[PDB]
């Protein structure tokens, strides 16, 4: 399932 | 509570119609964060969370968006009585900011997964009563704007968000949580974290947004992920077009991570007439050097990842070395684990795999190989030097034996004849070490046979070998 990531953090 | 000029582009029936709305808002005195986040959330919901019935684009009707907007402004204005919090001279008080923060916080669902996608926007807050960590801080700023608190603004590090306010914009307040299993500091300043020299607070060189940079944030917060396997092309395109709009207006000048995000999007699908990804990565680095004392890590990580994807070994190593040169002047502190994890993956997975492939291509007769370039060896050393210096003075250690095995392996990928060409000079390639660990390792770094046990002893706290 898709996940949150801190906005505009690099990588996947 | 929208003004009549805000409504004339509806319905929004395309990506370009969304862009036109952002352009119109960014042309106003102050762009309406609540309107824009509702629009983005609405479109993301119907392009990523629930695409059932999608034909071109989820048409955003005025009556839907206005109803959502009114739910939000009613919730905030009914829960925050500004008369209890007198405002001298266009300055908000800490008690008022705390009140707004508590209204948002206390609105959220009691129990939900905080790492879910698509819970970043005010659409999520209104319809699902769910927000991610940084989404709370954004919502607090949007609420403040709805209340006419023009001095309250979003502050951003590379892994956390809070608010600035107050006389001259100098006051800070924590408004959301950070990480998992960390203790909340809501209402507090960020001064202890700046004073500690943690990465999380960037030694005070964090982003203080104006309203236009807050718009940029919400654009960077778009999440095209449908699942782990697949992204929405429409949401990628929307993000990309909105970033170019902000770029052209000057609003990414002080936002390194946004320039890197734009670069990544350009690599995937280049916009005719626009700067190349590499140019944009270099612009992100230049922004960090210009506005933030070159204290940011991710501008260099964005560049390194680009080179690593493109199998540019020399330039990848250079960029990680540059990353480490930034981290060396920080202390590794308790809530800095995300950047620890990034460095750990680079040292112990990414660089090993790059050098493994290089070793194969060298066997196949590559010319100009990184593995025969002493400057590349120097970059590898400078990477480790920065990590070791980072550890110096830190309340938490960084290195352990798990790092040592990969260091010995990576050193070993360069022939002794290459390694010998680097001159390590004290204060061909010349290198100065800043860390005491690497200074002590100097003589071991040029033996034809790398002394694995000696290296491990030098890199780690271990000082004895097995008794038996």
Numbering used by the authors:
A (entry chain B): 4 to 15
B (entry chain A): 2 to 53, 74 to 386, 399 to 460, 548 to 588
Question: What do the authors report?
Answer:
On the contrary, mutations of G331 to arginine or aspartate perturb the charge in the MLL1 binding site on menin, resulting in decreased MBM1 binding affinity. The crystal structures of G331R and G331D revealed that both mutations do not show steric clashes with MBM1, and the side chains of R331 and D331 approach Gly14 from MBM1. The relatively short, 7 to 8 Å, distance between the guanidine groups of R331 in the G331R variant and Arg8 and Arg12 in MBM1 likely results in unfavorable electrostatic interactions, which could be partially compensated by favorable contacts with E368 and E371, leading to a modest, 3-fold reduction in the affinity to the G331R variant. We have also calculated the electrostatic potential for the wild-type, G331R, and G331D menin variants and found that in all cases the MBM1 site on menin has a strong negative charge that is minimally perturbed by either of the two G331 mutations. This analysis suggests that the electrostatic potential in menin is optimized to match the charge of the MBM1 motif in MLL1, and an introduction of either positive or negative charge distorts the charge complementarity between menin and MBM1, leading to a decrease in the binding affinity. However, reduced binding for G331 menin mutants was not observed for the longer MLL14-43 and MLL1160 constructs. This indicates that the presence of the second motif, MBM2, compensates for the partial loss of the MBM1 affinity towards G331 mutants. First, we tested competition with MLL1160 and found very similar IC50 values for wild-type menin and the three mutants M327I, T349M, and G331R, ranging between 4.1 and 8 nM. However, activity against menin mutants is significantly reduced, from 5-fold for G331R to over 100-fold for M327I.
